[PDB]
Design a protein around this motif. Sequence first.
Motif, PDB file in Angstrom:
ATOM      1  N   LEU A 128      -1.116  -6.125  -6.519  1.00 22.51           N
ATOM      2  CA  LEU A 128      -2.322  -5.394  -6.185  1.00 22.51           C
ATOM      3  C   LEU A 128      -2.320  -4.016  -6.842  1.00 22.51           C
ATOM      4  O   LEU A 128      -1.346  -3.629  -7.521  1.00 22.51           O
ATOM      5  N   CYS A 137       0.836  -1.193   0.000  1.00 28.04           N
ATOM      6  CA  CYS A 137       0.000   0.000   0.000  1.00 28.04           C
ATOM      7  C   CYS A 137       0.873   1.246   0.000  1.00 28.04           C
ATOM      8  O   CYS A 137       0.539   2.249  -0.621  1.00 28.04           O
ATOM      9  N   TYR A 142      -2.017   5.475   7.827  1.00 27.52           N
ATOM     10  CA  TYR A 142      -1.427   4.272   8.447  1.00 27.52           C
ATOM     11  C   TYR A 142      -0.061   4.602   9.052  1.00 27.52           C
ATOM     12  O   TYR A 142       0.166   4.409  10.245  1.00 27.52           O
ATOM     13  N   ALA A 147       0.069   6.352  12.406  1.00 28.75           N
ATOM     14  CA  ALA A 147      -0.371   5.448  13.454  1.00 28.75           C
ATOM     15  C   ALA A 147       0.637   4.339  13.706  1.00 28.75           C
ATOM     16  O   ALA A 147       0.693   3.777  14.788  1.00 28.75           O
ATOM     17  N   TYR A 149      -5.853  -2.408  17.164  1.00 30.18           N
ATOM     18  CA  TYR A 149      -4.670  -2.633  16.319  1.00 30.18           C
ATOM     19  C   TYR A 149      -3.789  -1.396  16.463  1.00 30.18           C
ATOM     20  O   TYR A 149      -2.561  -1.462  16.447  1.00 30.18           O
ATOM     21  N   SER A 150      -4.472  -0.267  16.612  1.00 29.36           N
ATOM     22  CA  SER A 150      -3.865   1.013  16.938  1.00 29.36           C
ATOM     23  C   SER A 150      -4.981   1.967  17.362  1.00 29.36           C
ATOM     24  O   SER A 150      -6.136   1.769  16.981  1.00 29.36           O
ATOM     25  N   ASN A 151      -4.664   2.979  18.158  1.00 26.07           N
ATOM     26  CA  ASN A 151      -5.669   3.959  18.578  1.00 26.07           C
ATOM     27  C   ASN A 151      -6.184   4.714  17.356  1.00 26.07           C
ATOM     28  O   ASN A 151      -7.353   5.097  17.273  1.00 26.07           O
ATOM     29  N   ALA A 152      -5.297   4.879  16.390  1.00 28.38           N
ATOM     30  CA  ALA A 152      -5.574   5.626  15.173  1.00 28.38           C
ATOM     31  C   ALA A 152      -6.352   4.798  14.148  1.00 28.38           C
ATOM     32  O   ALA A 152      -6.588   5.253  13.034  1.00 28.38           O
ATOM     33  N   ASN A 174       2.372   5.580  17.122  1.00 24.85           N
ATOM     34  CA  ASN A 174       1.476   4.788  17.966  1.00 24.85           C
ATOM     35  C   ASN A 174       1.976   3.347  18.078  1.00 24.85           C
ATOM     36  O   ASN A 174       1.977   2.761  19.161  1.00 24.85           O
ATOM     37  N   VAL A 175       2.430   2.802  16.954  1.00 23.19           N
ATOM     38  CA  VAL A 175       2.812   1.388  16.861  1.00 23.19           C
ATOM     39  C   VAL A 175       4.325   1.254  16.653  1.00 23.19           C
ATOM     40  O   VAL A 175       4.981   2.195  16.198  1.00 23.19           O
ATOM     41  N   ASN A 203      -8.306   7.872  13.546  1.00 24.74           N
ATOM     42  CA  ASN A 203      -7.765   8.399  12.291  1.00 24.74           C
ATOM     43  C   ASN A 203      -8.560   7.836  11.117  1.00 24.74           C
ATOM     44  O   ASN A 203      -8.859   8.540  10.151  1.00 24.74           O
ATOM     45  N   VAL A 204      -8.901   6.553  11.222  1.00 28.22           N
ATOM     46  CA  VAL A 204      -9.663   5.857  10.193  1.00 28.22           C
ATOM     47  C   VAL A 204     -11.138   5.813  10.581  1.00 28.22           C
ATOM     48  O   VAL A 204     -11.492   5.290  11.639  1.00 28.22           O
ATOM     49  N   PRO A 260      -5.649  -1.598  -1.623  1.00 27.85           N
ATOM     50  CA  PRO A 260      -5.030  -1.462  -0.293  1.00 27.85           C
ATOM     51  C   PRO A 260      -6.062  -1.350   0.829  1.00 27.85           C
ATOM     52  O   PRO A 260      -5.953  -2.017   1.863  1.00 27.85           O
TER      53      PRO A 260
END
Lengths: 139, 139
Positions: free
Chosen positions: B30, A57, A124, A127, B124-127, A131-132, B131-132, B46
Amino acid sequence: MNILYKTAATSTGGRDGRATSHDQKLDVKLSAPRELGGAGAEGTNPEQLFAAGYSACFLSAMKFVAGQNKQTLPADTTVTAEVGIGPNEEGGFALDVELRVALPGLDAAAAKTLVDRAHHVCPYSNATRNNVAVRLVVA
Amino acid sequence: MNILYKTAATSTGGRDGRATSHDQKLDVKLSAPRELGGAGAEGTNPEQLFAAGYSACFLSAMKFVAGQNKQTLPADTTVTAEVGIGPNEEGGFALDVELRVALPGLDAAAAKTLVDRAHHVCPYSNATRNNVAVRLVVA
Protein backbone atom coordinates in the motif's frame (compact mmCIF):
# COMPACT_ATOMS: atom_id res chain seq x y z
CA MET A 1 -11.79 22.70 5.46
CA ASN A 2 -9.46 22.46 2.47
CA ILE A 3 -9.43 18.75 1.63
CA LEU A 4 -6.25 18.11 -0.32
CA TYR A 5 -6.86 14.40 -0.88
CA LYS A 6 -10.19 12.56 -0.74
CA THR A 7 -11.25 9.05 -1.73
CA ALA A 8 -14.56 7.22 -1.31
CA ALA A 9 -14.83 3.55 -0.40
CA THR A 10 -17.87 1.30 -0.43
CA SER A 11 -18.22 -1.67 1.85
CA THR A 12 -20.99 -4.20 1.24
CA GLY A 13 -22.30 -7.00 3.44
CA GLY A 14 -20.98 -9.95 1.42
CA ARG A 15 -20.57 -13.30 3.20
CA ASP A 16 -19.46 -11.42 6.31
CA GLY A 17 -18.03 -8.25 4.83
CA ARG A 18 -16.81 -6.61 1.65
CA ALA A 19 -14.55 -3.59 1.20
CA THR A 20 -13.81 -1.71 -2.01
CA SER A 21 -12.05 1.61 -2.52
CA HIS A 22 -14.70 2.75 -4.96
CA ASP A 23 -12.29 4.71 -7.13
CA GLN A 24 -10.89 1.26 -7.98
CA LYS A 25 -7.95 1.45 -5.58
CA LEU A 26 -9.16 -1.51 -3.49
CA ASP A 27 -11.51 -4.48 -3.95
CA VAL A 28 -11.70 -7.41 -1.49
CA LYS A 29 -13.94 -9.27 0.95
CA LEU A 30 -13.36 -10.23 4.58
CA SER A 31 -14.96 -12.67 7.01
CA ALA A 32 -14.42 -13.93 10.55
CA PRO A 33 -13.96 -17.75 10.33
CA ARG A 34 -16.37 -19.92 12.35
CA GLU A 35 -13.88 -20.64 15.14
CA LEU A 36 -15.52 -18.83 18.08
CA GLY A 37 -18.84 -18.06 16.43
CA GLY A 38 -18.09 -16.26 13.19
CA ALA A 39 -19.74 -16.27 9.76
CA GLY A 40 -18.21 -19.10 7.75
CA ALA A 41 -15.43 -18.28 5.29
CA GLU A 42 -11.65 -17.99 4.86
CA GLY A 43 -11.48 -14.27 4.04
CA THR A 44 -9.79 -11.68 6.25
CA ASN A 45 -10.56 -11.25 9.96
CA PRO A 46 -11.93 -7.78 11.02
CA GLU A 47 -9.54 -6.87 13.86
CA GLN A 48 -6.82 -8.59 11.85
CA LEU A 49 -7.63 -6.23 8.96
CA PHE A 50 -7.42 -3.16 11.23
CA ALA A 51 -4.17 -4.53 12.68
CA ALA A 52 -2.58 -5.21 9.28
CA GLY A 53 -3.72 -1.87 7.93
CA TYR A 54 -2.76 0.16 11.00
CA SER A 55 0.66 -1.51 11.22
CA ALA A 56 1.32 -0.83 7.52
CA CYS A 57 -0.01 2.69 8.09
CA PHE A 58 2.43 3.08 10.98
CA LEU A 59 5.30 2.64 8.51
CA SER A 60 3.93 5.39 6.24
CA ALA A 61 3.23 7.54 9.31
CA MET A 62 6.85 7.08 10.37
CA LYS A 63 7.85 7.58 6.73
CA PHE A 64 6.47 11.09 7.22
CA VAL A 65 7.57 11.44 10.88
CA ALA A 66 11.18 10.64 10.01
CA GLY A 67 10.94 13.36 7.38
CA GLN A 68 10.04 15.95 10.02
CA ASN A 69 12.42 14.40 12.55
CA LYS A 70 15.27 14.78 10.06
CA GLN A 71 16.03 11.07 10.45
CA THR A 72 16.10 8.15 8.01
CA LEU A 73 14.53 4.72 8.55
CA PRO A 74 15.44 1.49 6.66
CA ALA A 75 13.04 0.04 4.08
CA ASP A 76 13.75 -3.41 5.55
CA THR A 77 11.91 -2.45 8.73
CA THR A 78 8.72 -4.37 9.53
CA VAL A 79 5.94 -4.31 12.12
CA THR A 80 3.95 -7.42 12.99
CA ALA A 81 0.55 -6.95 14.62
CA GLU A 82 -0.41 -10.07 16.55
CA VAL A 83 -4.06 -9.77 17.60
CA GLY A 84 -5.94 -11.94 20.06
CA ILE A 85 -9.60 -12.03 20.98
CA GLY A 86 -10.88 -13.37 24.28
CA PRO A 87 -13.79 -12.91 26.72
CA ASN A 88 -13.86 -10.23 29.42
CA GLU A 89 -15.42 -10.31 32.89
CA GLU A 90 -17.87 -7.72 31.56
CA GLY A 91 -19.39 -10.66 29.69
CA GLY A 92 -18.44 -9.53 26.20
CA PHE A 93 -15.41 -9.87 23.94
CA ALA A 94 -12.07 -8.14 24.42
CA LEU A 95 -9.30 -7.42 21.94
CA ASP A 96 -5.64 -7.72 22.87
CA VAL A 97 -3.12 -6.83 20.18
CA GLU A 98 0.62 -7.10 20.63
CA LEU A 99 2.33 -4.74 18.19
CA ARG A 100 5.77 -6.19 17.45
CA VAL A 101 8.14 -3.58 16.04
CA ALA A 102 11.19 -4.76 14.10
CA LEU A 103 13.53 -1.89 13.18
CA PRO A 104 16.88 -3.23 11.88
CA GLY A 105 20.12 -2.03 13.42
CA LEU A 106 18.08 -0.82 16.39
CA ASP A 107 18.56 -1.89 20.01
CA ALA A 108 15.60 -3.02 22.12
CA ALA A 109 16.38 -0.58 24.95
CA ALA A 110 16.35 2.29 22.46
CA ALA A 111 13.44 0.76 20.52
CA LYS A 112 11.36 1.06 23.69
CA THR A 113 11.60 4.85 23.58
CA LEU A 114 11.57 5.25 19.77
CA VAL A 115 8.44 3.13 19.40
CA ASP A 116 6.91 4.94 22.40
CA ARG A 117 7.34 8.43 20.95
CA ALA A 118 6.47 7.33 17.42
CA HIS A 119 3.40 5.59 18.85
CA HIS A 120 2.67 8.81 20.78
CA VAL A 121 2.87 11.45 18.03
CA CYS A 122 1.16 9.49 15.23
CA PRO A 123 -2.69 9.31 14.96
CA TYR A 124 -4.48 6.03 15.87
CA SER A 125 -1.49 5.18 18.08
CA ASN A 126 -2.74 7.44 20.91
CA ALA A 127 -6.21 5.90 20.82
CA THR A 128 -4.80 2.42 20.47
CA ARG A 129 -2.54 2.58 23.50
CA ASN A 130 -4.18 4.81 26.09
CA ASN A 131 -7.72 3.85 25.04
CA VAL A 132 -7.28 0.41 23.46
CA ALA A 133 -5.29 -2.68 24.52
CA VAL A 134 -2.25 -2.70 22.28
CA ARG A 135 0.87 -4.13 23.93
CA LEU A 136 3.88 -2.43 22.34
CA VAL A 137 6.51 -5.12 21.95
CA VAL A 138 9.84 -4.06 20.49
CA ALA A 139 11.84 -6.61 18.55
CA MET B 1 -4.92 -12.38 28.80
CA ASN B 2 -7.12 -15.47 28.25
CA ILE B 3 -7.20 -15.20 24.46
CA LEU B 4 -9.58 -17.52 22.61
CA TYR B 5 -8.29 -16.84 19.08
CA LYS B 6 -5.09 -15.07 18.06
CA THR B 7 -3.86 -14.18 14.57
CA ALA B 8 -0.86 -12.24 13.21
CA ALA B 9 -0.35 -9.79 10.35
CA THR B 10 3.10 -8.51 9.39
CA SER B 11 3.67 -5.23 7.53
CA THR B 12 6.94 -3.96 6.03
CA GLY B 13 7.69 -0.39 4.99
CA GLY B 14 8.53 -1.69 1.53
CA ARG B 15 8.23 0.98 -1.17
CA ASP B 16 5.60 3.16 0.49
CA GLY B 17 4.06 0.48 2.64
CA ARG B 18 3.38 -3.26 2.78
CA ALA B 19 0.76 -5.35 4.61
CA THR B 20 0.58 -9.13 4.80
CA SER B 21 -1.76 -11.09 7.03
CA HIS B 22 0.79 -13.77 7.91
CA ASP B 23 -1.83 -16.53 7.87
CA GLN B 24 -1.90 -15.85 4.11
CA LYS B 25 -5.18 -14.06 4.68
CA LEU B 26 -3.73 -10.92 3.07
CA ASP B 27 -0.70 -9.94 1.00
CA VAL B 28 -0.47 -6.50 -0.65
CA LYS B 29 1.59 -3.34 -0.81
CA LEU B 30 0.00 0.00 0.00
CA SER B 31 0.89 3.67 -0.20
CA ALA B 32 0.14 6.84 1.74
CA PRO B 33 -0.93 9.94 -0.27
CA ARG B 34 2.54 10.53 -1.74
CA GLU B 35 0.78 13.50 -3.33
CA LEU B 36 1.16 15.25 0.02
CA GLY B 37 4.10 13.52 1.67
CA GLY B 38 4.54 9.81 1.07
CA ALA B 39 7.20 7.70 -0.66
CA GLY B 40 5.67 6.82 -4.04
CA ALA B 41 3.73 3.66 -4.88
CA GLU B 42 0.45 2.57 -6.48
CA GLY B 43 -1.19 0.93 -3.47
CA THR B 44 -3.98 1.50 -0.97
CA ASN B 45 -4.22 4.62 1.20
CA PRO B 46 -4.04 4.01 5.01
CA GLU B 47 -6.98 6.37 5.56
CA GLN B 48 -9.16 4.45 3.13
CA LEU B 49 -7.91 1.11 4.46
CA PHE B 50 -9.04 1.86 8.02
CA ALA B 51 -12.25 3.51 6.81
CA ALA B 52 -13.26 0.59 4.58
CA GLY B 53 -12.11 -2.03 7.06
CA TYR B 54 -14.05 -0.22 9.78
CA SER B 55 -17.16 -0.04 7.59
CA ALA B 56 -16.99 -3.74 6.73
CA CYS B 57 -16.11 -4.52 10.36
CA PHE B 58 -19.14 -2.49 11.45
CA LEU B 59 -21.31 -4.67 9.20
CA SER B 60 -19.72 -7.76 10.76
CA ALA B 61 -20.29 -6.30 14.24
CA MET B 62 -23.90 -5.44 13.40
CA LYS B 63 -24.24 -9.00 12.09
CA PHE B 64 -23.11 -10.47 15.43
CA VAL B 65 -25.18 -7.89 17.33
CA ALA B 66 -28.24 -8.97 15.37
CA GLY B 67 -27.25 -12.50 16.32
CA GLN B 68 -27.30 -11.73 20.06
CA ASN B 69 -30.33 -9.47 19.66
CA LYS B 70 -32.13 -12.33 17.91
CA GLN B 71 -32.86 -10.06 14.96
CA THR B 72 -31.88 -10.19 11.28
CA LEU B 73 -30.50 -7.37 9.12
CA PRO B 74 -31.01 -7.03 5.30
CA ALA B 75 -28.11 -8.46 3.27
CA ASP B 76 -28.60 -5.68 0.71
CA THR B 77 -27.05 -3.13 3.06
CA THR B 78 -23.90 -1.12 2.30
CA VAL B 79 -21.68 1.41 4.10
CA THR B 80 -19.73 3.98 2.10
CA ALA B 81 -16.72 5.43 3.93
CA GLU B 82 -15.61 8.67 2.27
CA VAL B 83 -12.27 9.90 3.65
CA GLY B 84 -10.61 13.24 3.03
CA ILE B 85 -7.43 14.85 4.32
CA GLY B 86 -6.45 18.51 4.43
CA PRO B 87 -4.31 20.99 6.42
CA ASN B 88 -6.07 22.03 9.63
CA GLU B 89 -5.86 25.34 11.49
CA GLU B 90 -3.42 23.59 13.85
CA GLY B 91 -0.90 23.22 11.03
CA GLY B 92 -1.10 19.46 10.63
CA PHE B 93 -3.09 16.96 8.59
CA ALA B 94 -6.77 16.50 9.44
CA LEU B 95 -8.94 13.59 8.34
CA ASP B 96 -12.57 14.28 7.46
CA VAL B 97 -14.44 11.00 6.93
CA GLU B 98 -18.09 10.95 5.90
CA LEU B 99 -19.36 7.54 7.01
CA ARG B 100 -22.47 6.70 4.98
CA VAL B 101 -24.75 4.05 6.44
CA ALA B 102 -27.12 2.70 3.79
CA LEU B 103 -29.56 0.27 5.40
CA PRO B 104 -32.54 -0.87 3.25
CA GLY B 105 -36.04 -0.98 4.69
CA LEU B 106 -34.95 1.81 7.04
CA ASP B 107 -35.75 5.55 7.23
CA ALA B 108 -33.30 8.38 7.56
CA ALA B 109 -35.15 9.58 10.66
CA ALA B 110 -34.90 6.15 12.27
CA ALA B 111 -31.41 5.51 10.88
CA LYS B 112 -30.29 8.69 12.66
CA THR B 113 -30.97 7.19 16.09
CA LEU B 114 -29.98 3.65 15.10
CA VAL B 115 -26.56 4.65 13.76
CA ASP B 116 -26.16 7.00 16.72
CA ARG B 117 -26.79 4.41 19.44
CA ALA B 118 -24.93 1.76 17.43
CA HIS B 119 -21.78 3.87 17.16
CA HIS B 120 -22.23 4.69 20.87
CA VAL B 121 -22.34 1.12 22.20
CA CYS B 122 -19.80 -0.24 19.70
CA PRO B 123 -17.44 2.22 17.94
CA TYR B 124 -13.86 0.81 18.07
CA SER B 125 -12.36 3.45 20.33
CA ASN B 126 -13.60 6.68 21.96
CA ALA B 127 -10.97 8.47 19.91
CA THR B 128 -12.44 7.13 16.65
CA ARG B 129 -14.87 9.99 16.77
CA ASN B 130 -13.36 12.40 19.31
CA ASN B 131 -9.92 12.29 17.65
CA VAL B 132 -10.98 11.33 14.13
CA ALA B 133 -13.42 13.76 12.50
CA VAL B 134 -16.22 11.54 11.22
CA ARG B 135 -19.45 12.74 9.62
CA LEU B 136 -22.19 10.23 10.49
CA VAL B 137 -24.34 10.35 7.36
CA VAL B 138 -27.30 7.98 7.18
CA ALA B 139 -28.60 6.76 3.83
